[PDB]
Design a protein around this nucleic acid. Structure first.
Ligand code: MG
Ligand code: MG
Ligand code: MG
Ligand code: MG
Ligand code: MG
Ligand code: MG
Ligand code: MG
Ligand code: MG
Ligand code: MG
Ligand code: MG
Ligand code: MG
Ligand code: MG
Ligand code: MG
Ligand code: MG
Ligand code: MG
Ligand code: MG
Ligand code: MG
Ligand code: MG
Ligand code: MG
Ligand code: MG
Ligand code: MG
Ligand code: MG
Ligand code: MG
Ligand code: MG
Ligand code: MG
Ligand code: MG
Ligand code: MG
Ligand code: MG
Ligand code: MG
Ligand code: MG
Lengths: 206, 226, 155
RNA sequence: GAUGUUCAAA
RNA sequence: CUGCAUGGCUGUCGUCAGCUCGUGUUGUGAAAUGUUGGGUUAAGUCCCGCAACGAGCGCAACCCUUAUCCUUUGUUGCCAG
RNA sequence: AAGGCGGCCCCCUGGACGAAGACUGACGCUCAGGUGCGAAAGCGUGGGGAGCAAACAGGAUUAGAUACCCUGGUAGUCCACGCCGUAAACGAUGUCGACUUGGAGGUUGUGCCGGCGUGGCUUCCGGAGCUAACGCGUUAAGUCGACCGCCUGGGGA
RNA sequence: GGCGUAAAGCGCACGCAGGCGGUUUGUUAAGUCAGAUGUGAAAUCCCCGGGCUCAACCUGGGAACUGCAUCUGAUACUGG
């Protein structure tokens, strides 16, 4: 059948909102459009930076961008020359003063976004897809995943007919609301066809 | 333990001749009113040596398991095993109780946790709801595994009150190379039981005689060790 | 001091509504030498998981074999499920002459000189079971002596 | 309780 | 332009009650068993039996709303005094 | 013996089995060729012909319907006497002999004191064993001996 | 090596030739077995050597060719 977004169903119950601000209808849509411009801008030139989550807060004075990159080294560079330039551009987007906050991804193989993006890059590089998914699952297990599930679907391996492969280790209880599920979706633009990679990561309840 | 003792209890009785087993021909004397009669002369002499063997097992501080899933000897086996400080199985013989020790041990550990928490442990966080579930689970795990809860290992010798009723138990014992002492009947088969004991299991006062007999041997041997 | 050999590996399948569910089986033989030899069959999703389970079962089901020096006591014929294996004692230094599945069982068993030919079905699981049956069939001169109450007149 | 033919290969 | 190259999304049976696994046992084996059967339940829900013993995903629960009480606040809502 | 054999009565006739003894004295077992018997359909000649029913005809059905369904209907089915020599003629299991745990029947004798014993035939379940498995299992496909028939990839055949 | 179902029990029976044959004693010694003797050419083969520088090659001796025939003996079984 059809499965509801794991983040969406429990967003009020457990998951934090990427945008955590208050607006009225006068600028509600404007803020959302600005957020979109910030996000799509950041992802395109920070693709090698292993950026995971873009959390934006909006005080009536500035724009606070908490970025959950796995490598701070690249996103900040030396003495923060890349981050000052980043502030000057992101500030211009929302036309307000800009605050950049950098978060540390200590456990990357435990993040649904990072693993999915790595699997998509392997598919683009032609790494056989049966091996990459298994390797990601093993890495997540050796570093403390209660449950894991990876679903690579599309024209797998240049196949004429699209196929759906999923592999689950451990325990993934989507129906239990108090459960916490780190879910993300990346897309692989392989030459033969678009390939969708889904990842579920279960890391305990409450 | 003699000729007169067993005949008085009426343990010489057997199943209808139509439900007999051909491998019981040595331990059968005759038929009366289409009912087989175990020959006391064949059993009693070789009954004592099996009881001596139980003493030889008890002398090495062995663990004797007594299995009586039969209603007739249900309370009989429990009291007989507990009187000698040994372990027993009574509610029902779960398959894999001996062969699948790892999975049974897991359930025994949960049973012990439920017991140490339901009574000694704090009843706080009862929520009035899960209290009746956990206690019922404890009763289920007590009837099934309570007898072997403090065994913490695999039985050195096995005692069975009816070979055909506990065929699964005897099969698990044979796989683990555990000596089996079973009170076989005209209907049962003696292929699996290492020390075959002919005798009726249907009578209440009959089984208590056999259970009292083996109980005295282990007590006699623990005292000899002391 | 325990010798482990993998006789054969195969991919089996169980059809379901979705399609094939591939699985792997491993036939392994465990022998410490001196005539103690066991075989185990294991099944798992992966070949390494399958071999370990097979080794575990084999260690549990090892059986003893009467052996004269490094050769068989007497000529032996063992048949399992249509697979007829034949074995016979050979001279010192003749080595092992047998089919690869059969050769594996004998080397780990502790047999060094033997001439073995396999008839009927050549399926590895059946032939190793027939070899194990035959090795058990073999009898020591002392066992024959005790059976017939003879004081080792034959040797 | 009427009738309902067929379907190259990968 | 081709949903018959795809992704994402969605309809459907259907909220249907199912889908499996670890170990044990069985069978030469593919496999089976549990998951069957007697009831029962909204339900593989639960129980008894039973070579099975447990476990997971689904079911349920957790989340939201309403039905009743208690406490806190009292404005912009309330009025017994 | 197999193919087979059902109202009753009579006539002629074959086999089987049980019981207790007399008698012969290995007279046996199996059998290539050979010979006899052998469902149904068919064939020959003479009958007989109610029903059924190939063929054939008409009606329907259907895209078509040389079929299935309907309404009819000849051979044939029946008899006598020949011929044919074939069947999934099957237990898909050649015949004779011995041995090898049991349990519930059916059916026909037969002794004993309501039961018990003892034979013949026959059905079901099932142990060991055997089997690739299904299964067979004292009526074996178990363990053996005697002799005969047959097989040796699928088609062609 | 097989023949219930993979290929494979004649449709069934009778029966001649043929094959096989319960049990005991005597006799024969046909089969059978033992001993002896003759033969089984050489080459080959195999073994232990020798000579070609080695090797192939060549060669000395032995083993083998246990097959056949006769003579003599045994008689447990089979046969008469
Ligand atoms: Mg929905
Ligand atoms: Mg073959
Ligand atoms: Mg489509
Ligand atoms: Mg379409
Ligand atoms: Mg439901
Ligand atoms: Mg097995
Ligand atoms: Mg299993
Ligand atoms: Mg099942
Ligand atoms: Mg099911
Ligand atoms: Mg089933
Ligand atoms: Mg049920
Ligand atoms: Mg459940
Ligand atoms: Mg159940
Ligand atoms: Mg005949
Ligand atoms: Mg003939
Ligand atoms: Mg006719
Ligand atoms: Mg005519
Ligand atoms: Mg008509
Ligand atoms: Mg008609
Ligand atoms: Mg024919
Ligand atoms: Mg035939
Ligand atoms: Mg017979
Ligand atoms: Mg049967
Ligand atoms: Mg039988
Ligand atoms: Mg063959
Ligand atoms: Mg056939
Ligand atoms: Mg026949
Ligand atoms: Mg004779
Ligand atoms: Mg002679
Ligand atoms: Mg010569």
């Amino acid at each position: 059948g059809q499965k509801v977004h794991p983040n969406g169903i429990r967003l009020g119950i457990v998951k934090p909102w990427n945008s955590t601000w208050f607006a009225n209808t006068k600028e509600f849509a404007d803020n959302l459009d600005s957020d979109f411009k910030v996000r799509q801008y950041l992802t395109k030139e920070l693709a090698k930076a292993s950026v995971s989550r873009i959390v934006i807060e909006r005080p009536a004075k500035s724009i606070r961008v908490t970025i959950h990159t796995a490598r701070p080294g690249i996103v900040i560079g030396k003495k923060g020359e890349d981050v000052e330039k980043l502030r000057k551009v992101v500030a211009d987007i929302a036309g307000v003063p800009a605050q950049i906050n950098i978060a540390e991804v200590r456990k990357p193989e435990l993040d649904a976004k990072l693993v999915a993006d790595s699997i998509t890059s392997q598919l683009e590089r032609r790494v056989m897809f049966r091996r990459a998914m298994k390797r990601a699952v093993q890495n997540a297990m050796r570093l403390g995943a209660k449950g894991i599930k990876v679903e690579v679907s599309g024209r797998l391996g240049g196949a004429e007919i699209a196929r759906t492969e999923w592999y689950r280790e451990g325990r993934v209880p989507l129906h239990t609301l108090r459960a916490d599920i780190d879910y993300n979706t990346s897309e692989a633009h392989t030459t033969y066809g678009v390939i969708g990679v889904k990842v579920w990561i279960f890391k305990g309840e409450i | 333990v003699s000729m007169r003792d067993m005949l008085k209890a009426g343990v010489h009785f057997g199943h209808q001749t139509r439900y007999w087993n051909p491998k019981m021909k040595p331990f059968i004397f005759g038929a009366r009113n289409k009912v087989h009669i175990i020959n006391l002369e064949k059993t009693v002499p070789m009954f004592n040596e099996a009881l001596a063997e139980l003493n030889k097992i008890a002398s090495r501080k062995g663990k004797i398991l007594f299995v009586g899933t039969k209603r007739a000897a249900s309370e009989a086996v429990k009291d007989a095993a507990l009187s000698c400080d040994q372990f027993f199985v009574n509610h029902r013989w779960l398959g894999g109780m001996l062969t699948n020790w790892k999975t049974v041990r897991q359930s025994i550990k949960r049973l012990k946790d439920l017991e140490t928490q339901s009574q000694d442990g704090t009843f706080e966080k009862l929520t009035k709801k899960e209290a009746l579930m956990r206690t019922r689970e404890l009763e289920k795990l007590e009837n099934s595994l309570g007898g072997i809860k403090d065994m913490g290992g695999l039985p050195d010798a096995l005692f069975v009150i009816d070979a055909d009723h506990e065929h699964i138990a005897i099969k698990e014992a044979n796989n683990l190379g555990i000596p089996v002492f079973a009170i076989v009947d005209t209907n049962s088969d003696p292929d699996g039981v290492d020390f075959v004991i002919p005798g009726n299991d249907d009578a209440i006062r009959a089984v208590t005689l056999y259970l009292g007999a083996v109980a005295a041997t282990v007590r006699e041997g623990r005292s000899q060790d002391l | 001091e325990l010798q482990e050999k993998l006789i054969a590996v195969n991919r089996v399948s169980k059809t379901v509504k979705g399609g094939r569910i591939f699985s792997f089986t491993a036939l392994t033989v465990v022998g410490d030498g001196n005539g103690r030899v066991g075989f185990g069959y294991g099944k798992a999703r992966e070949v390494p998981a399958a071999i370990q389970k097979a080794m575990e079962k084999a260690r549990r089901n090892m059986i003893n074999v009467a052996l004269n020096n490094g050769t068989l006591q007497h000529p032996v014929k063992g048949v399992h499920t249509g697979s007829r294996v034949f074995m016979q004692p050979a001279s010192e230094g003749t080595g092992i002459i047998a089919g690869g599945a059969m050769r594996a069982v004998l080397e780990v068993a502790g047999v060094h000189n033997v001439l073995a030919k396999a008839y009927g079905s050549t399926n590895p699981i059946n032939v190793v079971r027939a070899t194990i049956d035959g090795l058990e069939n073999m009898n020591s001169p002392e066992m024959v002596a005790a059976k017939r109450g003879k004081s080792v007149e034959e040797i």
